[PDB]
């Protein structure tokens, strides 16, 4: 069965990660693509209910989130992950988990101890409308 | 359209074989089935866990949530479980009920024996017939 891919959105709270991810989801579902917004905050209620909010627990939450993304992508989904992921190592580990799974991984930086990504696939900035920004993610996936 | 979980339990009892053959037959019919293997999850998602009593319980708790997540995404989730104890199965069941996902317990007979499974698979049955019995349950 077909395999999906992951778009990982990193950036400070208030940078529009969840808004953009949700609009991309809607636009992809209209396309007939099984898109899915994977939010770590939701996972915290069930799967990840053992974790707290220490830095170590946040790293672990993200490590787990990257494996849930590869699992959903293995199941065919276009996974959209809005996660602050402030450390480069958070994003590097998620990238490595995807490489090992053979799942394509796109990093989108929603720009405003946050370590700024040097080489994202796409950098979004607040001049543009959320609709425009969503279309830029869509253009990235279709390129 | 929400999926469902089939939870296979038993001792070599043919659990992973029936789970795989059901997946294959469902995939041929255009049904999005998926075999969710706890040991595979231990190499990735659950790589933080050891093998203590508490760890084995946590591994099952997490597996049950992964199943509900996948079923919520529309998959028919097939779980060749290592869940010898009744309380294990009960926890998995409760997770599914709390999520509003239908849960089917399939006992691959040959450890606390299931008292009230949806289906009992008997070892005299050719594994084509066993998988077909599972599919018939799912299609009824």
Numbering used by the authors:
A (entry chain A): 440 to 551, 582 to 612
B (entry chain B): 441 to 451, 453 to 551, 583 to 612
Published text:
Alternatively, APS can be phosphorylated at the 3′-position by APS kinase (CysC) to generate 3′-phosphoadenosine 5′-phosphosulfate (PAPS), a substrate for sulfotransferases that catalyze the transfer of the sulfate group onto a variety of metabolites. The structure of CysC is characterized by the canonical α/β-purine nucleotide binding fold, consisting of a five-stranded parallel β-sheet which is flanked on both sides by two α-helices.
CysC contains three cysteine residues, Cys514, Cys549 and Cys556, and we therefore examined their role in CysC activation. The Cys556Ala mutant also displayed activation upon addition of DTT, but to a lesser extent. Surprisingly amino acid replacement at position 556 resulted in mutants with severely impaired catalytic activity. The Cys556Ala mutant showed little activity upon treatment with DTT, whereas the conservative replacement of Cys556 by serine resulted in complete loss of enzymatic activity, which could not be rescued by the addition of DTT. During structure refinement it became evident that an approximately 30 residue long segment (residues 552–581) in both chains of the asymmetric unit lack electron density and cannot be modeled, possibly due to loop disorder. This peptide stretch corresponds to the lid domain that closes over the active site cleft upon binding of the nucleotide ADP or AMP-PNP, respectively. The mutagenesis results highlighted the role of Cys556 as an essential residue in proper function of the lid region of the enzyme. Lid closure is essential to enzymatic activity and disturbance of the packing interactions of the lid with the protein core, even by a conservative cysteine to serine substitution, leads to the loss of enzymatic activity.
